[PDB]
Scaffold this motif. Structure first.
Motif, PDB file in Angstrom:
ATOM      1  N   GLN A  94       5.643   6.784  -8.141  1.00 25.43           N
ATOM      2  CA  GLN A  94       4.918   5.535  -7.908  1.00 25.43           C
ATOM      3  C   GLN A  94       5.761   4.295  -8.191  1.00 25.43           C
ATOM      4  N   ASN A  95       6.652   4.360  -9.177  1.00 27.78           N
ATOM      5  CA  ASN A  95       7.537   3.244  -9.481  1.00 27.78           C
ATOM      6  C   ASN A  95       9.002   3.541  -9.179  1.00 27.78           C
ATOM      7  N   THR A  96       9.288   4.593  -8.419  1.00 30.00           N
ATOM      8  CA  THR A  96      10.614   4.778  -7.850  1.00 30.00           C
ATOM      9  C   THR A  96      10.750   3.932  -6.590  1.00 30.00           C
ATOM     10  N   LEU A  97      11.999   3.626  -6.213  1.00 29.69           N
ATOM     11  CA  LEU A  97      12.217   2.909  -4.957  1.00 29.69           C
ATOM     12  C   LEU A  97      11.856   3.753  -3.744  1.00 29.69           C
ATOM     13  N   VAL A  98      12.044   5.074  -3.818  1.00 32.33           N
ATOM     14  CA  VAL A  98      11.670   5.938  -2.698  1.00 32.33           C
ATOM     15  C   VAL A  98      10.157   5.914  -2.482  1.00 32.33           C
ATOM     16  N   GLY A  99       9.382   6.041  -3.564  1.00 35.12           N
ATOM     17  CA  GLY A  99       7.934   6.008  -3.445  1.00 35.12           C
ATOM     18  C   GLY A  99       7.399   4.639  -3.073  1.00 35.12           C
ATOM     19  N   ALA A 100       7.960   3.579  -3.665  1.00 34.75           N
ATOM     20  CA  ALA A 100       7.464   2.228  -3.408  1.00 34.75           C
ATOM     21  C   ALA A 100       7.787   1.769  -1.990  1.00 34.75           C
ATOM     22  N   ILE A 101       9.003   2.051  -1.510  1.00 36.68           N
ATOM     23  CA  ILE A 101       9.345   1.732  -0.125  1.00 36.68           C
ATOM     24  C   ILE A 101       8.543   2.600   0.843  1.00 36.68           C
ATOM     25  N   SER A 102       8.476   3.914   0.586  1.00 37.73           N
ATOM     26  CA  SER A 102       7.830   4.832   1.520  1.00 37.73           C
ATOM     27  C   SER A 102       6.318   4.649   1.580  1.00 37.73           C
ATOM     28  N   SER A 103       5.693   4.161   0.499  1.00 42.11           N
ATOM     29  CA  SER A 103       4.243   3.980   0.469  1.00 42.11           C
ATOM     30  C   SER A 103       3.760   2.915   1.444  1.00 42.11           C
ATOM     31  N   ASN A 104       4.644   2.025   1.888  1.00 41.82           N
ATOM     32  CA  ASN A 104       4.338   1.062   2.934  1.00 41.82           C
ATOM     33  C   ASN A 104       4.676   1.594   4.323  1.00 41.82           C
ATOM     34  N   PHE A 105       5.007   2.877   4.432  1.00 39.07           N
ATOM     35  CA  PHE A 105       5.227   3.549   5.704  1.00 39.07           C
ATOM     36  C   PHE A 105       4.308   4.759   5.802  1.00 39.07           C
ATOM     37  N   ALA A 106       3.970   5.141   7.036  1.00 43.06           N
ATOM     38  CA  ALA A 106       3.024   6.235   7.230  1.00 43.06           C
ATOM     39  C   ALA A 106       3.692   7.605   7.191  1.00 43.06           C
ATOM     40  N   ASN A 107       4.932   7.715   7.662  1.00 43.33           N
ATOM     41  CA  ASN A 107       5.571   9.011   7.828  1.00 43.33           C
ATOM     42  C   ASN A 107       6.971   8.988   7.239  1.00 43.33           C
ATOM     43  N   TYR A 108       7.449  10.166   6.843  1.00 40.29           N
ATOM     44  CA  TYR A 108       8.828  10.323   6.401  1.00 40.29           C
ATOM     45  C   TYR A 108       9.406  11.602   6.992  1.00 40.29           C
ATOM     46  N   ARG A 109      10.735  11.643   7.041  1.00 40.03           N
ATOM     47  CA  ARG A 109      11.492  12.801   7.490  1.00 40.03           C
ATOM     48  C   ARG A 109      12.769  12.860   6.664  1.00 40.03           C
ATOM     49  N   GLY A 110      13.239  14.072   6.392  1.00 40.83           N
ATOM     50  CA  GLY A 110      14.459  14.256   5.640  1.00 40.83           C
ATOM     51  C   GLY A 110      14.222  14.649   4.197  1.00 40.83           C
ATOM     52  N   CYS A 111      15.332  14.711   3.466  1.00 41.74           N
ATOM     53  CA  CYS A 111      15.364  15.314   2.142  1.00 41.74           C
ATOM     54  C   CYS A 111      15.216  14.275   1.039  1.00 41.74           C
ATOM     55  N   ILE A 112      14.464  14.639   0.004  1.00 40.14           N
ATOM     56  CA  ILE A 112      14.411  13.893  -1.246  1.00 40.14           C
ATOM     57  C   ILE A 112      15.484  14.458  -2.169  1.00 40.14           C
TER      58      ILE A 112
END
Lengths: 268, 35, 258, 238, 238, 35, 238, 35
Positions: free
Chosen positions: G97-115
């Motif tokens: 929730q407070n990572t940059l991956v989660g905070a940036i991605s939460s304003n997008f609907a879909n993701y692809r690729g590896c964490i």
């Protein structure tokens, strides 16, 4: 190169403190075409009007306040013989032609020396109604002698006192506040000008072409150029120095075109 | 140029969109010179 | 550096003239005359004609004159009074009195930057109603022309002659706007911002030019004279200067220190 | 066939600053040409470069009327370690209010480049003296001491054959542009102070008049530039 | 796809002088051609150049009715130092009101070029005389004296074999164009006066009729030009 | 030309925007001559 | 002539995401250029690739206050066959929730690729130990046993000279894209679990401090991609 | 490119549709380096 004697026709005027000739707004205000709006043959220049004319202004004193000024309308000073400026053949040609187009060469002389301080702004100012009283009539020579200098005040800064048409009894008389023939006294150095400082020179030179709203204008009514002599720094000196120095001016017309030859002008 | 941006295409002819004067027959200029 | 200001010419200096430095790079050109004046601004507010007007008489106007003041707009930056050109600008500071309050107009934005003696441009005119959903039309007649002040009868309805003519008429839609550009139509070469001459040889007023204008506009309802109500309606005038050119550098108005 | 069109949401909007032409109503009009008329003004910075008079109050303390503002500063014989005249470099200040630089620039939002202050000594030719002309960057307190003026950007002007000195105020700004009008009196609008100090006293032979005067001009440098035209102040008409 | 469009604020406005075409409703119509018909008029100045009769009142003082306006001026034997006829050069004046130059020009705002006045002597062939035709620039007082007419632009016309004299009024104007109608009676609308003076008396052998008449025509010169069409005067229909 | 400024492009054909006459099979002219 | 046009039914509609420009009102404006300023961000995935701290609760059961969330997991000496920490691979979970991956991605609907999960051992240099890092595909029950973690995708991390281990979570999805937020907790939004098991106990020489801590980072792989921007959550401002 | 699709034709000039900076006289960059 401060000694210059400029020759025109049978008249030559000399100065030993020349600051140069202010050529605005062309490199030569004598280079000019026949006026395209009249098809009769113009009366062009000849050697008895290709000359200088000299007149006298009122004396500059200690009591003359800052920005007090004298207004010399051109060619209106020739028509009114303001300051003894008799124009001879040039005025005789003015009264017999309906149209007139020319530029002007002006030189103003004031006899300062050392032990005096003060500065005079000498500008050719387009376009003025400063020769006219607020009632709409032009100033007589008696009134120009009685002033003896026009004082700057609230009127002549805002244009509040410029000549106007009265509305009449039908309308409410409005509060007159502003007009476009104002003098902004701090901004008079935008015009073609030189400064007659007591420190450096006794004479100044300004050279201007013809300008107008039309390629020629009526001889009787035009005031497209006005020689404005305005105090920037008042006169001061210790007692024993020369009281009341005199101001003279020399006026030469350049490339005159006259149109509409007719009889001598008689007012209605 | 003036305050004009739609430079690509003009619908009306120049003598209808503007006036033109009739025939008779940056780097800034100084407004005064000294001799 | 040493100079003589009495010369009348002073060279525009830089930081590197006396000290160590360089020129500041240029980054704007908005002081261009063709760019600066090419923007719309409020000229005047005129009443809307609902009948055939009687054009305002020349000055001095006397008592009992039957005329329609406040309907005609001179297309001038110069000051006006009662739809006629003026020298002094006038205003009214107090309501009380008796007599007609004359309409006066100025382009304050023009004289704030004129700063020159002579001006010439084409003139975009834009007409905006101050009343909502007004159906109105604009009538123009050029410099030197005059208003045709009469009416003609169609089916016992008086139809004024200013609905027609050879000069442009522009009908706005209901709640619409009118916009068109006008050429320099004067007999004169240019418009004098300030003027020292006289128009006549006798009884003229010094400093009052006769044809320093782009003509006169008026607003009218496109309905005959029988259709009238008491409610007066108002119209604002916007002007824009196209291809503006200037001559003869001059002064800017005095700013009071009070 | 009818061309398919999608009118945008801002249709029928009148925009006063729109960079496009409108429909002509009265075309095919030829105006009288303008070959004869000289002095054509392409750009208002050409008049900004022309020096015009500044304004100051004449003398403290008693004045007959407060309207007696004057384009010069008189130089008294008395010595005290304060400047004779000082004014902020702020184009909305009253010292620029009736100059062409201030009047033209006040109808613009931003300026860039150097202001050029021109001085003129109007005293007698027999007068000799020296003046220190100093420009101070912005500071927590305005400098008053001649030693403090000497630490700033300064030039010494000698009274002699040439009567005038052109002082170019350097353009020292954190941003590329500066605000014309000091609303909040920030660093982006007020660029410090110019000050005049007398270096030596003015010396006179006897029967010279006392207290000569220095005439002040303000003018735009050749690098001076203006941006973003704004609404005028109509205060002059009232 | 729909083309994105931004309709201007002056949409749906009808403008009577718009320089553009409208939609055709009844096209594919061929009209009868016009090969046979001569006298095609390209330009109204072609009819302005055609001389037509001016108008003056016949005789002072008593007239049977004031409607007795006449295209000639009778020449009396009596001598007094005033012109026989005079009229201002002002195209809205009644002397031009029913000429083609005045009637065509009155529907235009401006004119440029020369007016051509044509005179015709309709007296007997045995008559001999001389007339001075003078054009005066505008003045504070209209000239009346023959000596004053001699100082203006003038031509002397001799009665002889050729019966007519074409006097071209010179175009002397401060502006490039002049106003057709003298609203304020300014210098831009009233271009002075034309006047007729008798130089010598008309001499007759006995049994000739007394008081011959000079027929007046007004016409446009070859340089004459009109500009800015205006609304007509509908006064003629009432 | 006439009172027309939009010269660049015409949408309708000439025989629909105007009439034309059918086949059968500046410097100013003077309106009168003398022999 | 007027061009025939057919305006579509969606005329005058304002559409917030329209891929087209509008009319300029205040053109001919030059801004100050930006040569000097470094660190230009072309794409937000450049900041998504930067590792930032995750969050977990410190210790069960008693805590002085529940707000004591911590970026590390302490490693106790006690052994029980359950993972030390585990979290679902679901980008709306509080651990992201407070990572940059989660905070940036939460304003997008879909993701692809590896964490990419990065671990950092912050204990003393004398400490030795081994950890098993395991990623489980989705299952009916979350795995807890080390034998069950060994059957999944796993890597053994040894404590030694290099203090950090970058664990790339493999992209194993039935669809080409995955949902950022688990509304219905479907297979398209929740991609199983990552778990940490201790393989051997951490061994210490005497006078070492007990319970060292593993610092956790979350980051986007080089193949990570985001799609379909959505409305933000304004919960942070209240 | 940006969120723009109507690429075929621009009516206004670039210096009116956008600002431009004045003259003075994918594959991703890493935000940090190690020496």
């Amino acid at each position: 190169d401060r000694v210059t004697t400029q020759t025109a026709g049978n008249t030559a005027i000399n100065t030993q403190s020349s600051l140069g000739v202010l050529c605005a707004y062309v490199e030569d205000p004598t280079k000019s075409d026949p006026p395209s709006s009249s098809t009769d043959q113009p009366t062009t220049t000849f050697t008895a009007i290709d000359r200088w004319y000299t007149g006298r202004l009122n004396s500059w004193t200690k009591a003359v306040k800052t920005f007090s000024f004298q207004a010399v309308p051109l060619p209106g000073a020739f028509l009114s013989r303001q300051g003894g400026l008799n124009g001879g053949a040039f005025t005789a040609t003015l009264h017999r032609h309906f149209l007139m187009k020319c530029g002007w060469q002006v030189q103003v002389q004031c006899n300062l020396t050392q032990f005096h301080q003060g500065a005079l702004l000498v500008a050719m100012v387009p376009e003025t109604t400063l020769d006219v009283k607020p009632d709409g009539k032009a100033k007589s020579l008696q009134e120009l002698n009685e002033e003896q200098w026009v004082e700057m005040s609230d009127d002549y800064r805002t244009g509040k006192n410029m000549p106007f048409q009265s509305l009449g009894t039908y309308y409410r008389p409005p509060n007159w506040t502003w007009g476009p023939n104002f003098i902004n006294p701090y901004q008079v150095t935008v015009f073609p000008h030189q400064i007659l400082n007591a420190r450096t020179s006794t004479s100044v030179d300004v050279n201007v072409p013809y300008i107008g709203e039309t390629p020629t204008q009526s001889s009787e009514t035009q005031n497209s150029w006005t020689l404005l002599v305005m105090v920037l720094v008042p006169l001061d000196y210790k007692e024993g120095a020369t009281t009341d120095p005199e101001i003279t001016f020399s006026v030469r017309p350049t490339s005159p075109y006259f149109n509409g030859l007719r009889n001598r002008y008689t007012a209605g | 140029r003036g305050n004009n941006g739609n430079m690509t295409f003009n619908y009306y002819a120049n003598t209808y969109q503007n006036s033109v004067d009739f025939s008779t027959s940056g780097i800034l200029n100084p407004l005064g010179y000294l001799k | 550096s040493t100079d003589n200001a009495e010369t009348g010419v002073i060279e525009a200096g830089n930081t590197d003239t006396d000290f160590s430095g360089e020129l500041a790079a240029p980054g704007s050109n908005h002081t261009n005359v063709k760019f600066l004046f090419d923007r719309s601004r409020l000229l005047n507010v005129i009443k809307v004609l609902e009948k055939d007007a009687v054009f305002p008489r020349p000055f001095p106007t006397q008592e009992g004159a039957q005329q329609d003041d406040g309907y005609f707009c001179l297309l001038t930056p110069r000051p006006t009074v009662a739809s006629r050109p003026a020298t002094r600008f006038g205003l009214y500071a107090n309501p009380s009195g008796s007599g007609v309050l004359a309409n006066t107009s100025l382009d304050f934005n023009f004289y704030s930057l004129a700063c020159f003696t002579y001006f010439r441009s084409d003139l975009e005119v834009t007409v905006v109603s101050l009343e909502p959903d007004l159906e109105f039309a604009v009538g123009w007649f050029p410099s030197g022309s005059e208003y045709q002040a009469s009416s003609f009868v169609y089916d016992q309805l008086h139809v004024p002659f200013h609905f027609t003519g050879r000069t442009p008429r522009a009908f706005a839609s209901k709640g619409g706007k009118v916009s068109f550009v006008l050429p320099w139509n004067s007999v004169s070469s240019v418009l004098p911002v300030r003027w020292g001459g006289a128009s006549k040889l006798s009884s003229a007023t010094r400093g009052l030019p006769a044809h320093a204008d782009w003509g006169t506009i008026y607003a009218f309802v496109p309905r005959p004279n029988e259709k009238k109500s008491t409610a007066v309606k108002h119209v604002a005038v916007y002007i824009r200067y196209k291809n503006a050119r200037a001559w003869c550098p001059s002064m800017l108005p005095f700013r009071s220190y009070k | 066939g009818p061309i398919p069109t999608a009118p945008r949401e801002n249709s029928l909007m009148f925009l006063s600053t729109l960079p496009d032409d409108t429909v002509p109503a009265y075309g095919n009009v030829r105006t009288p040409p303008v070959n004869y008329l000289p002095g054509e003004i392409t750009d208002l910075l050409q008049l900004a470069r022309i020096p015009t008079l500044m304004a100051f109050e004449r003398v403290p303390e008693p004045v007959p009327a407060s309207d007696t503002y004057v384009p010069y500063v008189a130089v008294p014989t008395q010595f005290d370690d304060r400047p004779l005249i000082s004014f902020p470099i702020t184009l909305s200040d009253p010292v620029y209010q009736n100059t062409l630089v201030g009047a033209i620039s006040s109808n613009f939002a931003n300026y860039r480049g150097c202001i050029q202050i021109t001085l003129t000594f109007c005293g007698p030719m027999m007068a000799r003296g020296k003046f220190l002309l100093s420009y101070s960057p912005p500071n927590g307190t305005q400098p008053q001491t001649l030693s403090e003026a000497m630490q700033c950007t300064y030039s010494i002007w000698d009274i002699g054959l040439n009567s005038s000195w052109t002082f170019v105020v350097p353009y020292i700004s954190p941003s590329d542009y500066r605000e014309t009008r000091a609303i909040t009196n920030s660093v982006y609008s007020a660029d410090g102070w110019f000050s005049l100090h007398k270096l030596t006293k003015i010396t006179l032979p006897p029967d010279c008049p006392q207290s000569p005067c220095i005439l002040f001009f303000a003018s735009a440098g050749e690098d001076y530039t203006l941006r973003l035209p704004v609404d005028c102040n109509p205060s002059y008409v009232f």
